Amino acid sequence: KCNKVRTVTEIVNSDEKIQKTYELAEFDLKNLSSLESYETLKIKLALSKYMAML
Amino acid sequence: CNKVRTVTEIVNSDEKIQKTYELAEFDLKNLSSLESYETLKIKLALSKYMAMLSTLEMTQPLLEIFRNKADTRQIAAVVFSTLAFIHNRFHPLVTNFTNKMEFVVTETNDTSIPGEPILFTENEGVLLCSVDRPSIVKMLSREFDTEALVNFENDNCNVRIAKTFGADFSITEVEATQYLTLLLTVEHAYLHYYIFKNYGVFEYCKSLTDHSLFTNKLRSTMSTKTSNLLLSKFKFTIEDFDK
Amino acid sequence: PSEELINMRRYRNAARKLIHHYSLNSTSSTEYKISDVVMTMIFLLRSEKYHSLFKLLETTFDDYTCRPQMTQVQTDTLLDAVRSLLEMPSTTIDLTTVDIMRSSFARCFNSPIMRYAKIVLLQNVALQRDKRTTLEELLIERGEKIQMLQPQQYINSGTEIPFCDDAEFLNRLLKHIDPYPLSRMYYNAANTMFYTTMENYAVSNCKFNIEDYNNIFKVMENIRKHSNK
Amino acid sequence: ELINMRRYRNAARKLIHHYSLNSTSSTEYKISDVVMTMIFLLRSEKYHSLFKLLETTFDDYTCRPQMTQVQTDTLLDAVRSLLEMPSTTIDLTTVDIMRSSFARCFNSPIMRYAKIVLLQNVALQRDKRTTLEELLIERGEKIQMLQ
Amino acid sequence: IKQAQSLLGIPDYSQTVVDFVKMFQKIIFPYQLVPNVIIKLNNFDQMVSSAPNKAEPYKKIRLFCKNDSIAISSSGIVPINMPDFSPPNTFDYSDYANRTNINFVTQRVLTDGGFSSGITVTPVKYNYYL
């Protein structure tokens, strides 16, 4: 599942067309980053609330 | 075999004469002039860049700047100017960029890095760069330098014997020669900088784990113009890796 | 008329040449006589000074690459006299250079070998550690603290470019520059950068300095390929 | 002093013993002991007499003047004194063979550190060749220069 | 001299040197010491100076004034009519001005400044008088 995503684009009336390709590996990584930061913040918040309430 | 042959004949076949020649030595003159003017172009470019630097209020010789460490100002200025020149040579379009960037001089061995004296953090909210003044000075330890030497050659009768037969601030050369050092260094850095600026941090893990493969990405990427890599040999003994 | 009646000038020049080579790694040369190593050593031993260094240098002869002991004051006087006798402009010539040279000598006599030796012992043992780490750990460790560190300057960073146009001035420069066979002169500079590439570390030093550094020069052929599509 | 004159003489003696009974090289022997040998010579007046000549021949091939019989005999005396063994008598001339050894020995290479290789044809006709069109464009230079 | 005036305010670029000369003269006795100006004079003549012709600063000025028991050299106070310094001395004994202490103090200095380069140090020295 390396998924070198593959793409092409066309002029209308199909004169000629162009190709490109790309890789999720950056995007999934950033997703993981965001996930962990998010949940870490949530946990920290919860702890803070508990402490203050006490 | 290229023993080009020639024949001439008068109207009415009254007479015919022959001669023969070879492109040899013609090709040699071509190659001669070719390398001549190209070397001239490279020299002119060097002069251009150095001259440009000359504007920048050199109250001190270049080396003094780094021998000092109190400053960061002059250093970052010079570095930025170098990067500007490089990008300009890649792009015949004088220009400006993300109009925020900034720098740090790393100052401890324990903050140094192997191989590369320069590194960029591409967008920590914005681009930032870090540089090793210590190691820079170590390159500045130019007691290294001496001119008196001798070039390798080969096959001179064919190859080189032909070439045998042709011929205040007024600062000296050695320092200028040293300029080339930081030139080529900043080139190598610019390569990775451009690469990741255009592409993924995965291929900024790579390119740094080894440089190596990036030739592929440079394919179809290079500006169709050469840079600073004339003399085609650059190598040592290799098989002697003796693992 | 004693045996000491010698070209001391010759012996000095050759000692300095040898040190300048093996320590500063200065530049290409042909420093390929075992003979005059002896002349160097005796040039040392014609003084109790510099013989003070030889006191340490002797320890090469037991050949085990033991990490040398420091007696701090005397090591400081050692460094002093070292730079002094080398007559260098105090280019920060330090303990690391000193032990580098120590290991050089602890690699020389190691050879009982008189046949020509193709042996660039790039390696050094004495890297203040049990064994070599990877580089990846340092890629973690330096990067972290670097991210902790904060900018030393601002750039105004608005649109700016410098240029100059004094064509006659520039041509005057060109003419002054004309003579130099830079073609020759800069290869040694590149070698300087090379040396620095490994001098960078006496710290679990990289092993694979070799073939990717070679690949950099292969990039020239890659540029030729890009030119040839 | 620091000098372990015990070991210095022991090493010198063994080294020269094997060397000189080969009349020639001492393959086993670490090069350091050459240095130790000359140290011994310099620090032993008894052997400066010949150390003198060894010095002279530390440069190539030099040939040595006459020695009077006093010198020859004191030389052989010091030789046998360093090499005190019942094994053999000693001859004056074999020093010449030992000389021819020493010369090459000390002339030997020592080491290398890595050195880059540089000069060659960067390229040839195996690269794009110039064509008339671009020269037409360029010589348009003169059609702009006019004057 | 032109440069020196330049650094100074230049109310009169035409002002005679002797002006500056005597102006400096006003302070000699009260400070009992030689102006750098006058030293550069008798320094940067070809001959009547330190004499770059031969590099002879040995021509130090011994300078005296009325009723003095003592004179002003180029190099401090001296007793009258004697050769600038007796070799016998309360010598700058090497326990002072030991390389070691010099270096140690210099390292302290360098650390404190946070300065990479351009620092040198030297002990003072003394002549007939201390």
UniProtKB/Swiss-Prot annotation, chain A:
Cellular location(s): Virion membrane
Coiled-coil intervals, chain numbering: none
Domain of life: Viruses
Record note on quaternary structure: Interacts with host mus209/PCNA, cdc2 and cdk6. Forms a complex with proteins C42 and p78/83.
Protein family according to the UniProt entry: Belongs to the baculoviridae E27 family.
Protein function: Acts as a cyclin-like protein and plays a role in the modulation of host cell cycle. May promote G2/S arrest by interacting with host mus209/PCNA, cdc2 and cdk6. The cell cycle arrest is characterized by an intact nuclear envelope, concomitant with sustained activity of host cdc2. However, viral DNA replication still occurs in the arrested cells.
Protein name as it appears in the record: Occlusion-derived virus envelope protein E27
Organism: Autographa californica nuclear polyhedrosis virus
Residues of the full protein shown: 5 to 58 of 290
UniProtKB/Swiss-Prot annotation, chain D:
One Gene Ontology cellular component annotation held by this UniProt entry: virion component
Domain of life: Viruses
Record localization: Host nucleus; Virion
Record's keyword terms, sorted: Host nucleus, Late protein, Virion
Primary role: Plays a role in host nuclear actin polymerization by recruiting p78/73 protein that is capable of activating an actin-related protein 2/3 complex to initiate nuclear actin polymerization.
Subunit structure: Forms a complex with proteins E27 and p78/83. The interaction with p78/83 mediates nuclear translocation of P78/83. Interacts with protein Ac102. Interacts with IE0.
Family listed: Belongs to the baculoviridae C42 protein family.
Name used for this protein in its record: Protein C42
Shown stretch of the complete protein: 112 to 258 of 361
UniProtKB/Swiss-Prot annotation, chain E:
Compartments reported by the entry: Host cytoplasm; Host nucleus
Record function comment: Plays a role in the transport of the budded virion (BV) to the host nucleus and for occlusion of viral progeny.
Name of the protein described by the UniProt record: Protein AC109
Species per Swiss-Prot/TrEMBL record: Autographa californica nuclear polyhedrosis virus
Boundaries of the shown chain within the full protein: 261 to 390 of 390
